[PDB]
């Protein structure tokens, strides 16, 4: 489990490697510091699926989408 974008990055297991559209698709899902309960989606590089998480409403990172489809578009090829 290593992925690359333009320059490359490694982590700890084995399934044929992903050239990620954008680097942020491999960032951990981040709730941020605010306390709301917002259902959002992010790309999980280990299951290779877009998955649900709870966003607090502020800050965080780019691996965060309002829909399954919006997430596919950014973090999945064609």
């Amino acid at each position: 489990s290593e992925e690359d974008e333009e320059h490359t990055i490694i982590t700890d297991t084995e399934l044929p490697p992903l050239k990620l559209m954008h680097s942020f698709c491999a960032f951990k899902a981040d709730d941020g510091p605010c306390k709301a309960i917002m259902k959002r989606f992010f790309f999980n590089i280990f299951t290779r699926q877009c998955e649900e998480f709870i966003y607090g409403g502020c800050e965080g990172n780019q691996n965060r989408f309002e829909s399954l489809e919006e997430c596919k578009k950014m973090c999945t090829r064609d």
Binding site: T11, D12, K28, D31, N44, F46, F53, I54, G56
Partner: peptide
């Protein structure tokens, strides 16, 4: 970056806890 079985930031589940 995500690491094997750690796809969320530190304290995600503990903070989530408290919200729900």
């Amino acid at each position: 970056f995500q690491s094997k079985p750690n796809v969320h930031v530190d304290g995600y589940f503990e903070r989530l806890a408290a919200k729900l």
